[PDB]
């Protein structure tokens, strides 16, 4: 029961941190895409 409890705690913590890492790399990809947006926007401004 205690073994199962700590295993459930570790599993839910791993799931939470996995969702966090997923949204973190998604935010990193969207930030790279926003930097590309800024580059293309500077190109649009020069045009």
Token representation of residue 30: 């969207």
Experimental approach taken: cryo-EM
The neighbour count for residue 13, using CB atoms within 10 Å, is 10
Annotated resolution, angstroms = 6.9
Instruction: Give 4-22 as a 3 state SS string.
Output: HHHHHHHHHHHHHHHHHHH
Buried-state track 38-47, b at ≥16 Cβ within 10 A, e below 16: eeeeeeeeee
Largest CA distance in the chain: 68
In angstroms, the CA 43 to CA 35 distance is 12
């Amino acid at each position: 029961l205690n073994q199962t409890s700590d295993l459930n705690e570790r599993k839910m913590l791993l799931q939470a941190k996995s969702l966090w890492i997923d949204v973190a790399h998604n935010t990193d990809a969207c930030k790279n895409l926003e930097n590309e947006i800024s580059g293309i926007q500077q190109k649009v401004d020069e045009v």
